[PDB]
Amino acid sequence: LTLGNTTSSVILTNYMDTQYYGEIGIGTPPQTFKVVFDTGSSNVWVPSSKCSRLYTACVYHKLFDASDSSSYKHNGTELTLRYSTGTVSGFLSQDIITVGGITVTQMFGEVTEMPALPFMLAEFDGVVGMGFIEQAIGRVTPIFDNIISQGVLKEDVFSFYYNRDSLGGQIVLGGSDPQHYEGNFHYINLIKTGVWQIQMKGVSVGSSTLLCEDGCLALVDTGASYISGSTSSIEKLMEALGAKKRLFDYVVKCNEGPTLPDISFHLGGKEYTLTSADYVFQESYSSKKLCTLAIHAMDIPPPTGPTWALGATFIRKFYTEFDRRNNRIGFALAR
Numbered sequence: 001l002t003l004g005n006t007t008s009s010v011i012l013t014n015y016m017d018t019q020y021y022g023e024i025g026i027g028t029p030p031q032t033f034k035v036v037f038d039t040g041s042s043n044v045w046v047p048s049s050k051c052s053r054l055y056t057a058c059v060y061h062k063l064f065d066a067s068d069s070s071s072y073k074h075n076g077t078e079l080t081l082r083y084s085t086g087t088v089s090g091f092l093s094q095d096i097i098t099v100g101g102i103t104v105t106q107m108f109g110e111v112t113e114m115p116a117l118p119f120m121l122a123e124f125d126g127v128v129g130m131g132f133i134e135q136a137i138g139r140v141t142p143i144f145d146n147i148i149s150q151g152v153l154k155e156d157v158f159s160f161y162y163n164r165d166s167l168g169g170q171i172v173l174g175g176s177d178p179q180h181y182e183g184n185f186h187y188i189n190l191i192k193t194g195v196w197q198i199q200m201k202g203v204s205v206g207s208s209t210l211l212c213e214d215g216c217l218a219l220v221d222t223g224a225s226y227i228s229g230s231t232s233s234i235e236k237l238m239e240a241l242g243a244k245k246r247l248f249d250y251v252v253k254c255n256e257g258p259t260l261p262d263i264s265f266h267l268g269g270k271e272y273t274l275t276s277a278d279y280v281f282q283e284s285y286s287s288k289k290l291c292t293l294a295i296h297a298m299d300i301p302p303p304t305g306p307t308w309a310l311g312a313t314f315i316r317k318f319y320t321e322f323d324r325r326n327n328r329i330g331f332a333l334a335r
């Protein structure tokens, strides 16, 4: 584990408080792509120029063309990424990727099949998985494991900062930016290495800790826009907020938004509270209009689930650092 002295930062654009993306470049000359950095997965992929134009999502995004890259190295093994809300498919390729000033030869997937739903709703073109190889598909080495191999990063960690719509957000590779957090960092260890998940001692909504009273799992997901729990949990949680469930999310009468109780997550002894302003898309104060909440149900299957997921809703309030070296996660108040 060679630790050098370079600390890179990736500037992020905040789209609707639901998607945080930055730029990376693939090949020579660089072909730029807008991507999301997802601690929830470990592969890197962008749409391919070989993607049939019958996939409208491909027509609406930047396409990587191997024929315009002199640094390209063929491979072709098929790859399928099945995410919680959709799937992408294609084949593996290799070329040089530039992220935050760092140039690393990376193996990525050239997607030739990306469904209109949900990808048509994606501002970004691709995803850059920030997880461990244990979660990587096709056994492809994650892009961070490769940067750590170049022994240039001061520290074997990276930090995320999600702003709330100046810069939309920021990722620091090799450290954290003291500019975006105050107070001390409070860490927790991962249940097991290979996944960015930690034990969660309990969840309290309002005056009663009616949820996860006997402990539960908490996944810290930078690629997730909201916070999620088992359908069972969310129904309890939403029942308590007085919210009514729609097809894909929960809402409340906008006038009722500001009166919503606080919601806390007991992580590693420290209490992480969010007021209604932190999880309600207060777009109106009218009683005659619905306001959606940044929390919904999601039943992640084992070995990972059942489990909660703390996404942008949570990270917007707490600066998050991911420590690969000591397999822990640290939180601090974001400023």
Ligand SMILES: CC(C)CCNC(=O)[C@@H]1CNC[C@H](N2CC(=O)N(c3ccccc3Cl)CC2(C)C)C1
Pocket (backbone or CB within 6 Å): 018, 019, 036, 038, 039, 040, 041, 042, 081, 082, 083, 084, 085, 086, 118, 119, 121, 122, 123, 127, 135, 137, 221, 223, 224, 225
């Ligand atoms: C391969 C394996 C690790 C699956 C488990 N991990 C996950 O499913 C990933 C867990 N973190 C969030 C990931 N995202 C889901 C999603 O809904 N996204 C999204 C957001 C807004 C608009 C459109 C889209 Cl597609 C972005 C991605 C990064 C795909 C999936």
Ligand SMILES: *[C@@H]1O[C@H](CO)[C@@H](O)[C@H](O)[C@H]1NC(C)=O
Pocket (backbone or CB within 6 Å): 074, 075, 076, 077, 092
């Ligand atoms: C693709 O990469 C894998 C991983 O090392 C390698 O074993 C395989 O031979 C490559 N495919 C080809 C034939 O280029």
